[PDB]
Design a protein around this ligand. Structure first.
Ligand SMILES: N[C@](CC1c2ccccc2Oc2ccccc21)(C(=O)O)[C@H]1C[C@@H]1C(=O)O
Ligand SMILES: N[C@](CC1c2ccccc2Oc2ccccc21)(C(=O)O)[C@H]1C[C@@H]1C(=O)O
Ligand SMILES: *[C@@H]1O[C@H](CO)[C@@H](O)[C@H](O)[C@H]1NC(C)=O
Ligand SMILES: *[C@@H]1O[C@H](CO)[C@@H](O)[C@H](O)[C@H]1NC(C)=O
Lengths: 723, 723
């Protein structure tokens, strides 16, 4: 039962006027689509001369009942510069596969599918309401705002759920949002039983149908295990979806589309009676089913005005301003039909100056804020959502409007209510302390594992850990780690108590020997020996007492200069002062031959005096040791004294021959047993010197052991009863 | 000017009957579409009772003139169970966006696009001719048959070229076919000038339009540089595309679709006059423009029958057998309309038992070979092409039919004519000899580079080359390479000439010494020396003459057993036989002390007699050397004789004391100068023994040099004037 009201050029429109007569989503809209043309053809601010006409049908929500109507539009190619509206999604996808085939554009006031932006097929389809592939980029950019980046989704089955959710994951992996489970309701209440077995995912992304999101929540009062319900448009502000589960569905957020409703439309529509409406074929039919009467009037107590009445009067203007540009720019100085308005080619209509129009909606303020009825490059207006909340003040439910957003989130941050006031992160990995600073993603993203790394190591990265180098221990963190000192044995340490007492024998070395050096040269056996030779033959014993304190005092390069040079003067006193005096005694002007022989091995040390390391080093044992106090090898100083014992190897040669023939009082016993006793400790401390850790007593105490036995057992016996 | 001939159920058809009246691709086909129904409604082998009707239009090749006709089909929803034919591509894509919207299937007799298989859009479109995305999988599987795997393409601009070529490359990379250039003609003849600058690509894949492949070939007679023209369907068997370039377009291959034409159609169509054809609105109109007469008859001299007349009568049957299945299987025991033929739902018509039908074409033999009118799962019959050739016998052109193919190539291999009889590979890289066996693809595929690899290396792969190991040289190929021998100096080599003469002095060593061994013990100075000691003191000189031939004969493990043990008995004869006889002479029952001293250093060699290597080794210099004839170090045998010269280090000690006091006739001169002379060559050959390559004379000749100087300069002088 169409109505075709004539005009200079006529618009066409489809509406549900069938199920019964629908009044919520139905005939309320067709009353509004008539109401705009009563203003546009009257208000001469827009199109002055060309009077608009209307010719509208009854879409009855059945697809192949809409298409049997839709050819009666195009039997005039009552020429029609476009058709307004396909309400549902499934009725608009059928008059968008017949209205590309006549090059005539379409504007649908409310149909919000997501296959209706694939403009490779539809070159003639521009809706005003936003596509629902934006709520997969709405909530996916508030979770990264709240850092709840580990979620658990649930869809519906059919066309709504499988489109948004498959667009939700691919619009989440950019924003580092990391799903856990994925259900699909077609089970009854066991869907929560498959949901509790991931219990660090406590943010439920709910992208659901209307009534198939009632059977979940009403059966989520059985298990009584609440959550944080973030929900897409399936909730809306419906107060029946939260029917009695206020103790269960507490603390939720939801989205809906904003529409500041037209005030004077209530001045239009409530002023409409079925005795003064002859310009409609359905006001008389609706009046029966409005009140179930067999025949009152419309009050404000039964005219709760629909939330998309603004979207028809917004989207019927976006042709009437893309035609007032036509009647001026394509035909100046011609208000009426200029004979170029005869064949109105739609291809240069839609793609040229309807695609990117810009103007303001009627009956609303803030003309630069939100009423800019823009388009994108696809035929889909910008998203203007609300973010409602179930933040109950305590009345019972109290749906709360905590703000809006268009392109970036603009919340009013005092609504996050979860248990009492909780912002649950719902995060899996829980990044740990720097004590476990190997926070490495094992195989997958977003859920890493912490690991305490090596105690000689610092964290090389957020996942990596590396040692800070040989020597130094780590820091208190992964910063610059430390340094590494050496063994400072300058104090006692039960190591400076021994040779400090052994130095007294070296201090008493030059004491008793100086008595026969000058004042007692007139002894009967002072002239019988090398009275000038003994002062050189006994001066080196104090050197052995001093080279221990020259070397083993503290690590220094001058000390290592004294350490390598300290031992090189021990053995010529031990051998050349000994052996040259015995050979002339074995058979006295030839006693001068022992002078230059001391410089034989000693001058060769002067060539190696500058070759090896002198300053310092640091030797590394198992992960904590730095002591190599001078940069020399252990076998380097041992080979430096290889000729030392080799020089006193012939020191026992003259002991065997003169073992029984003393040329003096006790020179065969005190001196003959001396070289046997001197080679004993000389051979004793040699293999032990390779193996030590403190190394002091094997160096210091063994050196003075030769020094004490030298002057006492040999030189002391000649003067002990002399007194 | 439609004709609507009634029936029990009526078929619908579109045809070009406009440009003028088209007779080649036009009204000849509509005469044939009428001719089939005159048989099907008459021959009771197929559908007995339901008389077929026809209702056909005039498509006039203009898209939005076809769609103004096409609603007059669907104004009855004269119900029509499908529409036959959209001839062009651009008329079929417009009645396939209006005939999905009524759930009615379509069969197009000749339209061969490649967007008309995207069955996600078109659920109601099944053509019979093959899609032209198959000739991108036809020629792309004969080039791999001929190994011409490096090509040079050329397209046309618009819809034909850019569809097949973009399908040609993606159907070539599987078969390892490797393009070089890619033109796009919209230049005039300079397109060849951009083509000669890749002159190892001499196979021109020509995927071209009809007339825009005339301006190339007629302008390829300018440059006179021929090729191998492989061409897709743009040639066909058109004899005008090769108008006068037989010397230029010689040697080509081309494709066309096979159709064995219906013989009795000529018995039908040539028996048609415009006085006995009242069942058509266009036989009277065609009769004017057939002969330009203002009013003869159709002869066989002007009725050259069209090549797709079989494709309309093939593809009008494939409904009439998908409806004879309907009137039996959906309504048994009911020949006529069974009241389930009232609402004939097309969704259960097309997708159920028209998609996979199988039967034989009328008026053709071989009912199991090629007339199986199958479908695939897309609505596109199987490809049955011809492979024509321009193999001129010499008449002038003589288009030649060298066979066919359906799913695999079935050529008759005697047509490859390029220059005289040439099969040009047109290949880029030209894989080289195993002398350049590093045939590695540098950065890209199909064009590798050959490289001679290392002469100590063999080809590890077709691209890789690796050395065969230390020692052995490569083989004649990349097989198992070789072995590596050692230096065999068993012959002379100017190395076995020297010590073979030096062995004679070792042979004359025991000659003169044996005279005073037994027969001349009664000499006055035989008893004055060690007459039993000299036989041990001179026996080892022959050992030194023999150890050279024991060691330096040939590499053997028993020889190395004699090489390490050969030198160990040289020095005790050189020192212990010498030094013990001198010490008792330096001041005679104590002459037995020199017996056990020979076993001092010698028994220590018995402990090392089994420790180091004994068998063999091979030392590797710069890429060609294997000789380390026994597995011992150079310093190993030199340290094995370190105590050797150390034992004769004290051999010069007694020479200084006894230099002037002879206890015999010349024992101070002949023996005193001997140990000075013995240490000379002993110190001489030592540093030279570290540095040699043949190593014989430093080993053999230096050993006998000590052996000759021992007995002659010392032992020979005592008996030289004795005679
Ligand atoms: N535009 C709606 C949107 C509809 C919908 C709305 C809310 C929740 C789920 C849901 O499911 C889908 C799925 C695909 C497309 C559209 C929807 C329509 O029915 O087409 C609806 C406002 C229109 C009206 O009620 O008049
Ligand atoms: N089927 C054809 C094929 C046509 C074509 C034929 C040969 C060379 C190039 C070429 O260009 C395209 C491009 C896209 C689709 C179809 C074609 C048609 O016109 O549609 C033609 C046999 C039909 C007739 O002449 O009646
Ligand atoms: C993480 O989310 C919290 C939520 O309050 C926010 O305050 C904070 O800025 C976010 N941090 C980062 C690094 O994104
Ligand atoms: C390469 O092509 C030639 C062409 O004659 C053919 O005979 C041969 O079998 C082909 N070889 C391979 C390995 O494909």
């Amino acid at each position: 039962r169409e109505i075709k009201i004539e005009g200079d050029l006529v618009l066409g429109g489809l509406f549900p006027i069938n199920e019964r007569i629908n009044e919520d989503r139905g005939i309320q809209r067709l009353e509004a689509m008539l109401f705009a043309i009563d203003e546009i053809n009257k208000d001469d601010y827009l199109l002055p001369g060309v009077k608009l006409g209307v010719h509208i049908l009854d879409t009855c929500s059945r697809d192949t009942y809409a298409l049997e109507q839709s050819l009666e539009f195009v039997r005039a190619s009552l020429l029609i510069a476009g058709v307004i509206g396909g309400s549902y999604s499934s009725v608009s996808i059928q008059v968008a596969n017949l209205l590309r085939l006549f090059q005539i554009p379409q504007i649908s006031y409310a149909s919000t599918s997501a296959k209706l932006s694939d403009k490779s097929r539809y070159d003639y389809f521009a809706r005003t309401v936003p596509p629902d592939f934006y709520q997969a980029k709405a909530m996916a950019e508030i979770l990264r705002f709240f850092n709840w980046t580990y979620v658990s989704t649930v869809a519906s089955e059919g066309d709504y759920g499988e489109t948004g959710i498959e667009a939700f994951e691919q619009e989440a992996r950019l924003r580092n949002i990391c799903i856990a489970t994925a259900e699909k309701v077609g089970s009854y209440d066991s869907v929560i039983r498959e949901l509790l077995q991931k219990p660090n995912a406590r943010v439920v992304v709910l992208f659901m149908r209307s009534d198939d999101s009632r059977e979940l929540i009403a059966a989520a009062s059985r298990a009584n295990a609440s959550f944080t319900w973030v929900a897409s448009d399936g909730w809306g502000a419906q107060e029946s979806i939260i029917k009695g589960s206020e103790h269960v569905a507490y603390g939720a957020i939801t989205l809906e589309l904003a529409s500041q409703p037209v005030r004077q439309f209530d001045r239009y529509f409530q002023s409409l009676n079925p005795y003064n409406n002859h310009r409609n074929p359905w006001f008389r039919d609706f009046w029966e089913q409005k009140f179930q009467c067999s025949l009152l009037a419309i009050d404000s107590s039964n005219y709760e005005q629909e939330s998309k009445i603004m979207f028809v009067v917004n989207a019927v203007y976006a042709m009437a301003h893309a035609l007032h540009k036509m009647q001026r720019t394509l035909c100046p100085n011609t208000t009426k039909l200029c004979d170029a308005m005869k064949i109105l080619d739609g291809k240069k209509l839609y793609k040229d100056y309807l695609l990117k129009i810009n103007f303001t909606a009627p009956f609303n303020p803030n003309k630069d804020a939100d009423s800019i009825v823009k388009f994108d490059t696809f035929g889909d207006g910008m998203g203007r959502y609300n973010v409602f909340n179930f933040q109950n003040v305590g009345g019972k439910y109290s749906y709360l409007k905590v703000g809006h957003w268009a392109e970036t989130l603009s919340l009013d941050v005092n609504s996050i209510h979860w248990s009492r006031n909780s912002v649950p992160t719902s995060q899996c990995s829980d990044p740990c302390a720097p004590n476990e600073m190997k926070n490495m993603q094992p195989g997958d993203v977003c859920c890493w594992i912490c690991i305490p790394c090596e105690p000689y190591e610092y964290l090389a990265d957020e996942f990596t850990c590396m040692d800070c180098g040989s020597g130094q221990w780590p820091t208190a963190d992964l910063t610059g780690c430390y340094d590494l000192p050496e063994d400072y044995i300058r104090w006692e340490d039960a190591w400076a108590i021994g040779p400090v007492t052994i130095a007294c024998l070296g201090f008493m070395c030059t004491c008793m020997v100086v008595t026969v050096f000058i004042k007692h040269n007139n002894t009967p056996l002072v002239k019988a020996s090398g009275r000038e030779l003994c002062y050189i033959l006994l001066f080196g014993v104090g050197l052995s007492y001093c080279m221990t304190f020259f070397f083993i005092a503290k690590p220094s390069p001058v000390i290592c200069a004294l350490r390598r040079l300290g031992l090189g003067s021990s053995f010529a006193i031990c051998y050349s002062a000994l052996l040259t005096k015995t050979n002339c005694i074995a058979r006295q002007v030839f006693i001068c031959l022992g002078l230059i022989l001391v410089q034989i091995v000693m001058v060769s040390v002067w060539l190696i005096l500058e070759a090896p390391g002198t300053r310092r080093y640091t030797l590394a044992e198992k992960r904590e040791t730095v002591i190599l106090k001078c940069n020399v090898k252990d076998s380097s100083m041992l080979i430096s004294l290889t000729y030392d014992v080799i020089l006193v190897i012939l020191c026992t040669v003259y002991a065997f021959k003169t073992r029984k023939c003393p040329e003096n009082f006790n020179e065969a016993k005190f001196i003959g047993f001396t070289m046997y006793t001197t080679c004993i400790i000389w051979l004793a401390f040699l293999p032990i010197f390779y193996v030590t850790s403190s190394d002091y007593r094997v160096q210091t105490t063994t050196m003075c052991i030769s020094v004490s036995l030298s002057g006492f057992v040999v030189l002391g016996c000649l003067f002990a009863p002399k007194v």
